[PDB]
Design a protein around this ligand. Structure first.
Ligand SMILES: Nc1nc2c(ncn2[C@@H]2O[C@H](COP(=O)(O)OP(=O)(O)OP(=O)(O)O)[C@@H](O)[C@H]2O)c(=O)[nH]1
Ligand SMILES: Nc1ncnc2c1ncn2[C@@H]1O[C@H](COP(=O)(O)OP(=O)(O)CP(=O)(O)O)[C@@H](O)[C@H]1O
Ligand SMILES: COc1cc2c(cc1OS(N)(=O)=O)CCN(Cc1cc(Br)c(OC)c(OC)c1)C2
Ligand SMILES: Nc1nc2c(ncn2[C@@H]2O[C@H](COP(=O)(O)OP(=O)(O)O)[C@@H](O)[C@H]2O)c(=O)[nH]1
Ligand SMILES: [Ca+2]
Ligand SMILES: [Mg+2]
Ligand SMILES: [Mg+2]
Ligand SMILES: [Mg+2]
Lengths: 422, 437, 316, 54
């Protein structure tokens, strides 16, 4: 359990994946040219987890960039760290997916998938001991949603004994591109229930609310939302990238956070929300667990936590961290399940993210996540009961029955979370 | 002269293994290069310390040990540690992919692929013995390797060395020093599979070692190094008789004869004192009576429980340092009147005592202060069943919903093994209640 | 706030303690099976002590002393007094008792009964001729309240906190009878509120302390403190200091407190006799409020603080 | 309070203090269970590959 292979598909997938590499390259002291100019050695001890080393002491990320149109991947190759990526790992087409799950999954996407698998196989074959894969994408479009899930299905067929992890962005009418987004998201969730071990649910509705109400941004942009997404992504990989007592990896994560195979959709949280006055430990814990700090638009007070994991970064008191975590558990013990003893894990890392003197990141497996699937389910049924906009999909070879199935499995998932909440 | 072989499995087993062998070399005057200037029989001998060390023609004293782990991070510390020159590469065994805190993954999936390699490395040590006693096995309950692979190794050792004794040193799981939510599952599965193959096992609860390091050593956040150097002191006093001249517990079979009347109830409770902080430039040196009295204080034992509400079956007192029998008997007579020490009516109400004149050894610059006398008590009491009930209840909470069970099934295990191992733990709990009334 | 759980719905005393704690605003009740709690109001039988004091960061307190049933079981109380050198059987305040089975003491009970039968003696048994569990001598010469020519028993409530301080409630209750004593029917022989139900002399057939102390002054020229209470305080001290090394939680990973109900018997020579020790007692209606609040003040909030006394501290 | 079996030497001594008198599976069976678990794993993997095949 050492090397991770990263993959990013579609517009959203390649934009948050780009900011992710820009952030962690900075934390490990890797410049845009792949050279190391850091001061400590903690940034080089586990660097092979995400970076390959080339002759000449250069560090090249182990990432693969995928898209059915070249618009977004051109901007990445021209960005701040565009020169850092291996040139061969750019795989893209020209037709695009038109925000249509069927095009990404069945027609346009099928032509390109084999080329992606060739690059994945090339990276995997060079791994001393491959952990698994992580994928970034949105569920409301065509490429990341439709083709992204097709890739997951194929990768599981060749590497069935490796972990599959995703960062999945949920659509919201408050930040919408097309009216068919509920269709695409319902079809992708069905796939995710079957073929991933861990999924971080990044809700665009929650990101918007945080920028508007807390950060006081009247007209938020995708750039603003991705600032929150990159902070969250850096926080939830800290324990994978730095040497610590934990020594975490993707399998131990899944083993300890997922009590039932289907219920592997996690709710992430971060604090503080982005000035020179560092926060006290009690401030971190309080903010980290507040609804205003959740990245999925669900109220944790409407459900219970199956498992929780939290990391603290900076130079702080471990005693004070323990004293504050045990405090929140024992003062909100009504929102934790009783039948999983010691289901809250805490860890500390001495390296704080750039700019902050200390921060805290939260991973939650809560039954309140059902409010998200309910939201998407109601939007789905309002259109489907009149067969509205279906011709876009029946023209790609799909039948109505396939929609009835994804909707049916989506509602089963909602009732499954309600089962374990009572 | 009869040899003993030690086996260290998983992270906990290997790290604790390093601590012990570091202390051994200090107590026997063996430098980190294997040289022993006090030994005058170069290349051989049948001395007491040769039960744990063999000798080469150049004068090196090599431990009779083997280190095993399904991943290599922890054993690489040994190969580059202060005592690297002590071991031979064939004695250290490492895999690629650990058991992911999964018993089934360590016993079935990955255990089958490496069991023969380890048995062949063990066979190489046995061949160099003329009169092998048995094995000492270190491991954890909670880890996927320490629980799953250990139980496979103990099954095979019984087959290849049917007449040899096997002792365990096991680390019982605690949330204060936690690593996985399924540690109750792995604890029950391995206790069920190892039981018929272990002659005597010493449990150490990480909650107890954690509280002692905080209370007595004034250490706010204890580390593995702190925990192990205190655990090494306990181990060194339990194995001192095998390495030094003496008459009490001079071979592995004596441990069963003096501590284990019933085969299944083979978990003696250990208690140690005094643990004094080395940060105190001076501390009153406790007497024989005082340190003996502390062996019946719950805050000093390796497994938190109330011996006042159980019955004893056997008791052994092991002293090290400036101790003479006269004082030991005075303290014993004193403790029988102050406290409640009730044996079972079918066992004698006595104590077996051993005294080693060499006082305890401490790591230079470590956390433990040098003392002039110390004692470790080994008592087989029913009160230790409290720890079985605590652990069995946590297993029942998760299993009622079948939570996490799919990770084990996916490795080839059947749900039936869960209830099978659980019913065995219910029978074990019942056997303690019959003895304790 | 502070955390407590409830595991005995039949507790009249702690039903008020759990209700008074809810009136504090600083205590909140959990589900009966939640492991993370500061205080447990646990069940009578098979309370799982072995699972207490193992939750990190939690100071856990419980309303029972493990091993305290040796004093509250009639068979084990007899054994405790006979085999305890601190009591040594020779204690002058416990009636001659013997334990039998349907080791046994059937042989030694009939031996002392022979020296007794020759002369008189009448015994009692629960769980005049011997031919017709534990057996002890029946106090054939009790103290009778006039008018009425009736017997009674005294109930005293004692509270022991985590530090093993012994607090004696200032308010007692005499559970009196209604029918004159006939040393020839068993209603005038057994003093119980349920058996009595009646209520002609006092309400509920229970006389409180201020009235009984006035009766002792006008009828006997003495006070309740000198004639009876001193002896009661001695018995309470002697019994609780005996088992202290066996149940004390002074160095244990969890802490204990427990309310006790001592039942005494007074004879016509103003001598106090201990009948039995109750581990799960009830209380009088006119005293449910004062006592239960005293518990929280001295026993609960003494470990879990917030933002004259009613007990007499029996030093030792 | 009796002491018995006092054994002295240069490294120490030992004795006993009494206060009151008193009132396996074969190699093939192992391999059998190990190979059974590997078969159940192989079965479960064949069903997934058959599911992905559809
Ligand atoms: N006292 C002590 N306990 C330890 C030590 N290392 C791990 N533990 C305990 O062991 C348990 C975890 O099992 P490990 O030994 O780390 O796991 P493993 O045997 O390596 O098996 P894997 O799951 O494959 O890693 C936890 O309960 C830890 O508290 C140690 O060095 N000293
Ligand atoms: N040796 C004795 N001499 C005089 N009276 C006795 C006696 N033994 C029992 N009694 C009477 O019997 C009554 C109840 O006896 P006992 O207390 O053993 O039953 P019990 O425990 O079920 C009710 P409680 O809980 O109030 O003690 C007492 O009120 C007492 O007056
Ligand atoms: C749900 O509980 C448990 C959770 C976990 C473990 C054990 C548990 O069980 S436990 N309490 O040890 O008994 C071990 C593996 N670990 C991985 C991890 C990844 C990340 Br990222 C983190 O950062 C947010 C983190 O937190 C700092 C931890 C999760
Ligand atoms: N948070 C975030 N969401 C995005 C971004 N770009 C697109 N989205 C969302 O993703 C969905 C559209 O999918 P998109 O990635 O554009 O389609 P694709 O290119 O076919 O994969 C809509 O719900 C958008 O709100 C982005 O940069 N950040
Ligand atoms: Ca020699
Ligand atoms: Mg788009
Ligand atoms: Mg390990
Ligand atoms: Mg009663």
């Amino acid at each position: 359990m050492r090397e991770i292979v990263h993959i990013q598909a579609g517009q959203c997938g390649n934009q948050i994946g780009a900011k992710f590499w820009e952030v962690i390259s900075d934390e490990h002291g890797i410049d845009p040219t792949g050279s190391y100019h850091g001061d400590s050695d903690l940034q080089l001890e586990r660097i092979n987890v995400y970076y390959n080393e080339a002759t000449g002491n250069k560090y090249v990320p182990r990432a693969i960039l995928v898209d059915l149109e070249p618009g977004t991947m051109d901007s990445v190759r021209s960005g701040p760290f565009g020169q850092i990526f291996r040139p061969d790992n750019f795989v893209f087409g020209q037709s695009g997916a038109g925000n249509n799950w069927a095009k990404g999954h069945y027609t346009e996407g099928a032509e390109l998938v084999d080329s992606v698998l060739d690059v994945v196989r090339k990276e995997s074959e060079s791994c001393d001991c491959l952990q698994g894969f992580q994928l970034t994408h949105s569920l409301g479009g065509g490429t990341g949603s439709g083709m992204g899930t097709l890739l997951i299905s194929k990768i599981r067929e060749e590497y069935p004994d490796r972990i599959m992890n995703t960062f999945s962005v949920m659509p919201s009418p408050k930040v919408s591109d097309t009216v068919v987004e509920p269709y695409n998201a319902t079809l992708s969730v069905h796939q995710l229930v079957e073929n991933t071990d861990e999924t971080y649910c990044i809700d665009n509705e929650a990101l918007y609310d945080i920028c508007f109400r807390t950060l006081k941004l009247t007209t938020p942009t995708y750039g603003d939302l991705n600032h929150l997404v990159s902070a969250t992504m850096s926080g939830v990989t800290t324990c994978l990238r730095f040497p610590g007592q934990l020594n975490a990896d993707l399998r131990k994560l899944a083993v300890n956070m997922v009590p039932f195979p289907r219920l592997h959709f996690f709710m992430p949280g971060f604090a503080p929300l982005t000035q020179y006055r560092a926060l006290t430990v009690p401030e971190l814990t309080q903010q980290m667990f507040d609804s205003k700090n959740m990245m999925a638009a669900c109220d944790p007070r409407h459900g219970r936590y199956l498992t929780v994991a939290a990391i603290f970064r900076g130079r702080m008191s471990m005693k004070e961290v323990d004293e504050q975590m045990l405090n929140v558990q024992n003062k909100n013990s009504s929102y934790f399940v009783e039948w999983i003893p010691n289901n809250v894990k805490t860890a500390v890392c001495d390296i704080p993210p750039r700019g902050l003197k200390m921060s805290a990141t939260f991973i939650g497996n809560s039954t309140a996540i059902q409010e998200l699937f309910k939201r998407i389910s109601e939007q789905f049924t309002a259109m489907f009961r009149r067969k509205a906009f279906l011709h876009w999909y029946t023209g790609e070879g799909m039948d109505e029955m396939e929609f009835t199935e994804a909707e049916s499995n989506m509602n089963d998932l909602v009732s499954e979370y309600q089962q374990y909440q009572d | 002269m009869r040899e003993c072989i030690s086996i260290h499995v998983g992270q906990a087993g290997v790290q604790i293994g390093n601590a012990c062998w570091e202390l051994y070399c200090l107590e026997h005057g063996i430098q980190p290069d294997g040289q022993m200037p006090s030994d005058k029989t170069i290349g051989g001998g049948d001395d007491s310390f040769n039960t744990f060390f063999s000798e080469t023609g150049a004068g090196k004293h090599v431990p009779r040990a083997v280190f095993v782990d399904l991943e290599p991070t922890v054993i690489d510390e040994v190969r580059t540690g202060t005592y690297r020159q002590l071991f031979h590469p064939e004695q250290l065994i490492t895999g690629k992919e650990d058991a992911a805190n999964n018993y089934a993954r360590g016993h079935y999936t990955i255990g089958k692929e490496i069991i023969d390699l380890v048995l062949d490395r063990i066979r190489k040590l046995a061949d160099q013995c003329t009169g092998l006693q048995g094995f000492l096995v270190f491991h954890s309950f909670g880890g996927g390797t320490g629980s799953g692979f250990t139980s496979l190794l103990m099954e095979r050792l019984s087959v290849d060395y049917g007449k040899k004794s096997k002792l365990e040193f096991s680390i019982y799981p605690a949330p204060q020093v936690s690593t996985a939510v399924v540690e109750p599952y792995n604890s029950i599965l391995t206790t069920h599979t190892t039981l018929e193959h272990s002659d005597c096992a010493f449990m150490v609860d990480n909650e107890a070692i954690y509280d002692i390091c905080r209370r007595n050593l004034d250490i706010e956040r204890p580390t593995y190094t702190n925990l192990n150097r205190l655990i090494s002191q306990i181990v060194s006093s339990i194995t001192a008789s095998l390495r030094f001249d003496g008459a009490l517990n001079v071979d592995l079979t004596e441990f069963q004869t003096n501590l284990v009347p019933y085969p299944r109830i083979h978990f003696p409770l250990a208690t140690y004192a005094p643990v004094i902080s080395a940060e105190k430039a001076y501390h009153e040196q406790l007497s024989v009576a005082e340190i003996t009295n502390a062996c019946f204080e719950p805050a000093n034992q390796m497994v938190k429980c109330d011996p006042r509400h159980g019955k004893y079956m056997a008791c052994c007192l092991l002293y090290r340092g400036d101790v003479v029998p006269k004082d030991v008997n005075a303290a014993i007579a004193t403790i029988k009147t102050k406290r409640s020490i009730q044996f079972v009516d079918w066992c004698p109400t006595g104590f077996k005592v051993g005294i080693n004149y060499q006082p305890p050894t401490v790591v230079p610059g470590g956390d433990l202060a040098k003392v002039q006398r110390a004692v470790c008590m080994l008592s087989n009491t029913t009160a230790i069943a409290e720890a079985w009930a605590r652990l069995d209840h946590k297993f029942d909470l998760m299993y009622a919903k079948r939570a996490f069970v799919h990770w084990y099934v996916g490795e080839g295990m059947e749900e039936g093994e869960f209830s099978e191992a659980r019913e065995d733990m219910a029978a074990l709990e019942k056997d303690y209640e019959e003895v304790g009334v | 706030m502070y955390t407590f759980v409830v595991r005995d719905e039949n507790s009249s005393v702690y039903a008020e303690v759990s209700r008074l704690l809810l009136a504090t605003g600083q205590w909140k009740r959990l589900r009966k099976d939640n492991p993370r709690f500061n205080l447990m109001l646990g069940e009578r039988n098979r309370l799982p002590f072995g699972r207490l004091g193992h939750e990190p960061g939690l100071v856990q307190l419980v309303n029972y002393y493990r091993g305290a049933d040796k004093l509250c079981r009639k068979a084990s109380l007899v054994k405790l007094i006979k085999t305890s050198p601190e009591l040594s059987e020779s204690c002058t305040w416990f009636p001659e008792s013997y334990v039998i089975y349907p080791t046994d003491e059937r042989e030694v009970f009939l031996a002392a009964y022979n020296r007794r039968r020759e002369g008189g003696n009448v015994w009692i048994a629960k769980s005049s001729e011997a031919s017709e569990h534990v057996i002890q001598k029946y106090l054939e010469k009790p103290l009778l309240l006039e008018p009425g020519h009736r017997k009674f028993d005294i109930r005293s409530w004692v509270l022991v906190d985590h530090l093993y301080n012994i607090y004696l409630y200032r308010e007692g209750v005499l559970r009196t009878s209604s029918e004159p004593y006939n040393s020839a029917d068993k209603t005038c022989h057994l003093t119980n509120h349920c058996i009595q139900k009646y209520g002609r002399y006092e309400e509920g057939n229970e006389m409180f302390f201020e009235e009984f102390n006035q009766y002792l002054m006008d009828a006997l020229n003495t006070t309740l403190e000198n004639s009876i209470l001193l002896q009661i305080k001695h018995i309470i001290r002697s019994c609780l200091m005996c088992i202290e090394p066996a149940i004390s939680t002074k160095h244990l990973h969890y802490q204990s407190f427990q309310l006790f109900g001592f039942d005494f018997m007074v004879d016509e020579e103003l001598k106090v006799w201990l009948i039995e020790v109750n581990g799960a007692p009830a209380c009088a209606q006119k005293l449910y409020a004062e006592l239960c609040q005293g518990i929280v003040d001295v026993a609960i909030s003494s470990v879990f603080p917030l933002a004259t006394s009613i007990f007499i501290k029996l030093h030792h | 309070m009796e002491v018995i079996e006092l054994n002295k030497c240069t490294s120490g001594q030992s004795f006993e203090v009494i206060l009151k008198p008193p009132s396996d599976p074969s190699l093939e069976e192992i391999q059998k269970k190990l190979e059974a678990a590997e078969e159940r794993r192989k079965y479960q993997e064949a069903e997934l590959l058959k599911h992905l095949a559809e």
